Amino acid sequence: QQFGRDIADTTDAVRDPQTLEILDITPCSFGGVSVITPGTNTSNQVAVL
Amino acid sequence: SFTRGVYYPDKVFRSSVLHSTQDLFLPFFSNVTWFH
Numbered sequence A: 001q002q003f004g005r006d007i008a009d010t011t012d013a014v015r016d017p018q019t020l021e022i023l024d025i026t027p028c029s030f031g032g033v034s035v036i037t038p039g040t041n042t043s044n045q046v047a048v049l
Numbered sequence B: 001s002f003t004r005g006v007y008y009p010d011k012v013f014r015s016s017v018l019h020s021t022q023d024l025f026l027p028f029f030s031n032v033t034w035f036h
Helices: none
Strands: A003-005 A011-016 A021-024
């Protein structure tokens, strides 16, 4: 085997050449950005989730 | 033939998953011509 696949059609692991070892590939982090705001009247200070 | 003639379809590695593929395979329990 040269590379591994998940239950879905996505690659989960690979056989790294130059060392013949197994490397797990994780989709690098991503996410939505939400803004906690009490309201323009209450305060302009906001938090980022 | 019983349950023989199955080969790895590719160099893809799969762990604890069921995979369905359509390739040239020997049918299960098929008649196989045997010679001495």
